[PDB]
Amino acid sequence: TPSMEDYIEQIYMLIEEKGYARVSDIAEALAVHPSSVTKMVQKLDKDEYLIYGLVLTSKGKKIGKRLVYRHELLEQFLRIIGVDEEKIYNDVEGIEHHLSWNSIDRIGDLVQYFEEDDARKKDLKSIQKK
Amino acid sequence: TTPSMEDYIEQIYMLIEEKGYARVSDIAEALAVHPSSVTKMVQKLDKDEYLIYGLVLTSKGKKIGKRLVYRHELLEQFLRIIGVDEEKIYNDVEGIEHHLSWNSIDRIGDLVQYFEEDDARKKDLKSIQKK
Ligand SMILES: [Mn+2]
Ligand SMILES: [Mn+2]
Ligand SMILES: [Mn+2]
Ligand SMILES: [Mn+2]
C-alpha cells in the first residue's frame, strides 16, 4: 500500500535519525493525526514489520532500507535531467509507489549512465536549450 | 483536476478519436466501473465545462484531452527506451502519469529526444545494463 509504504519509509528514517520513532514524530512527519498513526502501527505490527518504543523487525528494516533507497534514487534522477529543485520532492513522493522494481532498476542504470561521463550531461543540457 | 478525473478525460478523448463518439457504456467498460459512477463524473465534467452531456468535448476538453494522451504516450516511450519489460509499462504509466509536474514531463521529453537522435546513446546505455 502507498500509505503503508510512506509510514515504513518515515519510521525507518526516524530510527536512523533519532535512534527511535515516537508516534508523535511520525504524526508530524506525515502531517496526520496521532489516531491515524496508531491505527497503522497496529496493522504493521500484525504484518510483522515492527513490534509495538516501536522496533522494526528484520523484515521492516529490509523494506525500510529499500524504500529510502528508492526515494533517494528518484530524487537523483529528476535532478540529473534538470527538473526544478523545488518540484522534485513532491513529484518523487507521488510516483515512488507506482513504479515497479523493473522500472526502478532501469532508472538506476540510467543514473549510472549519466554519472560515468559528464559529457553526456552536457549533451542533454544542449537539447534542453533547443 | 483529480487523478481519476484525468483518467476519464483521457479515455473519452481516445474513444472519440477511435470510434467517433463516446458512449457512457463504452467508458464504463474501458475503466471497468459501473455506469452510475461514469454518469456522476460526466456531470462534474459538464459542470467544469470540459464537455456537454451524446458526449461532446468543448475546446477546453479537447485541449486537455490531447495533452493527457500526449503525456501517456511520452511516458510509455520513456520506459520502453530505458529497457523496462513491455508488459509492466502500461501499469506503471497509468499510476505515475498523474503525479508528475509539467516540469518533469518536459524534461522527460528532452531525455527521450536525447536518445532518439543518436542510436549510439542507446547502445551505451544498454552496455551499462550489461555490467
Ligand atoms: Mn518517499
Ligand atoms: Mn510517498
Ligand atoms: Mn494514461
Ligand atoms: Mn491513470
Residues A109/B125, Cβ–Cβ less than 8 Å: yes
Which parts of chain B fold into alpha helices (H)? 3-19, 24-31, 35-47, 59-81, 86-96, 102-116, 119-129
Residues B3/B98, Cβ–Cβ less than 8 Å: yes
Q: Calculate the CA A114 to chain-centre distance.
A: 21
- One domain for residues A37 and A77: no
Smallest Cβ distance to B129: which of A109, A120, A123? A109
Chain B CB contacts of A87 below 8 Å:
101, 103-104
- One domain for residues B30 and B62: yes
Q: Which residues of A are annotated as a binding site for Mn(2+)?
A: 6, 9, 71, 93, 96-97
- One domain for residues B74 and B50: no
Cell numbers representing residue B42 in the block: 460526466
DSSP-derived letter for residue B82 is: T
- One domain for residues A89 and A125: yes
Rounded-to-integer distance, Cα B68 and Cα B98, Å: 9
> What is the structure's resolution, reported in angstroms to one decimal?
1.9
Rounded-to-integer distance, Cα B54 and Cα B52, Å: 8
Chain A CB contacts of B129 below 8 Å:
106, 109
Which parts of chain A fold into alpha helices (H)? 2-18, 23-29, 34-46, 58-80, 85-95, 101-115, 118-129
Rounded-to-integer distance, Cα B104 and Cα A36, Å: 32
Distance from Cα A68 to the centre of ligand 1, integer Å: 7
- Alpha carbon separation from A59 to A45, A48, A49, A56 (Å, rounded): 11, 7, 6, 7
Domain that holds residue A75: 68-130
- One domain for residues A56 and A76: no
Beta bridge partners of A55: A51
Residues B104/A91, Cβ–Cβ less than 8 Å: yes
Report which of A101, A34, A29 is spatially closest to residue A63, judged by C-alpha positions: A101
Number of domains in chain A: 2
Name the CA dihedral angle for A104, A116, A88, A127, rounded to a multiple of 10 degrees: -110
Cell numbers representing residue A114 in the block: 549519466
Chain B CB contacts of A121 below 8 Å:
none
Q: Calculate the CA A92 to chain-centre distance.
A: 8
